[PDB]
């Protein structure tokens, strides 16, 4: 099992003060993202305003510069995909733009080096117009002509925990690209006092428990590796726990005791179902700075790294 840690990387320049507690994400070129991350998730892929297919190109950087960041990440080690979505996206793929849906993806992988694509759907895109049919029969078709060239086109997603039930909005998308996602790396962050009722203990979990954290990091993903008590399974082996880089990156779910996750991890794999890592948003808030001016300094790169690869022999790297 090739364990990944994966960061999400702002293609916007910070409008400063963006953060929930009054913080500033960093901006930085994609090839400058902290060493440590070898998943890295441009955002996003969306539709422009006045436009009516998603798209993507980099704020910052002509395409040949772009690519050449990319090449240059890959030849490091590290993985690149496009996350389409993220909010006000203004994604809502119609049964007839499949077609050209999955040329404009084909075409930013060949234009940029993308290794693969995140599906990161904000809520009101879960089930807006044909998204449900469209977005996993275009990647099917994606991953397929890649494959015809021995190339691996990743797929991943970055599901919102509570819409993960057996018979949930996100079923389609998962059930359908069953053998076709390499990972998810749901967000185990944003949802409050939302979390799962835990029958042995008596209790609810919430994801704002920072008493219980370890237990509803434990519980949530067992709950998902196993599909049970209401959830969609989902195979360890293609499981990613994602967390807040901090409390400036999500209004909550910041982890306060990492040895939460240690202990999560190490329980998950003595159960028998090993995960393949976390995830984060963002670089570019690991990066920041919180109200004061104080930097973030890469806490959640330095801590949860090592915690992943240190000693570890299987070590997710591109090619
Ligand atoms: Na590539």
Redesign the pocket.
């Known amino acids: 099992l090739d364990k990944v840690l994966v960061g999400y990387w702002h293609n916007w320049k910070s409008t400063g003060k963006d953060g929930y507690k009054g913080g500033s994400s960093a901006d930085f070129n994609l090839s400058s993202t902290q060493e440590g991350y070898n998943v890295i998730n441009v955002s996003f892929m969306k539709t422009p305003e006045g436009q009516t297919l998603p798209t993507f190109k980099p704020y910052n950087k002509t395409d040949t510069e772009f690519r050449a960041e990319?090449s240059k990440l890959?030849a490091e080690g590290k993985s690149?995909l496009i996350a389409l979505g993220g909010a006000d996206a203004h994604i809502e793929l119609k049964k007839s733009q499949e077609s050209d849906f999955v040329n404009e993806i084909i075409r930013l992988v060949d234009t940029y080096?993308?290794?693969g694509l995140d599906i990161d759907l904000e809520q009101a895109a879960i089930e807006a117009a044909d998204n449900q049919t469209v977005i996993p029969s275009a990647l099917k078709k994606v991953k397929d002509h890649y494959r015809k060239d021995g190339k691996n086109f990743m797929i991943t997603m970055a599901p919102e925990f509570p819409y993960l039930t057996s018979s949930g909005k996100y079923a389609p998308y998962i059930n359908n690209l069953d053998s076709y996602y390499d990972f998810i790396n749901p967000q185990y962050y944003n949802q409050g006092g939302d979390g799962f009722w835990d029958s042995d203990l008596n209790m609810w979990i919430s994801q704002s428990n920072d008493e219980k954290k370890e237990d509803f990091l434990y519980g949530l993903t067992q709950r998902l590796v196993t599909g049970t008590d209401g959830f969609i399974k989902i195979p360890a082996s293609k499981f990613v726990i994602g967390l807040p880089s901090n409390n400036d990156a999500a209004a909550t779910g910041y982890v306060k005791d990492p040895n939460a996750v240690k202990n999560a991890l190490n329980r998950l794999k003595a159960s028998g179902n090993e995960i393949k890592g976390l995830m984060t948003w963002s670089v570019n808030w690991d990066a920041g700075t919180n109200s004061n001016g104080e930097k973030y300094n890469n806490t959640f790169v330095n801590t949860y790294a090592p915690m992943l690869f240190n000693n570890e022999g299987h070590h997710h790297h591109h090619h």
């Open positions: 990319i890959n690149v080096g993308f290794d």
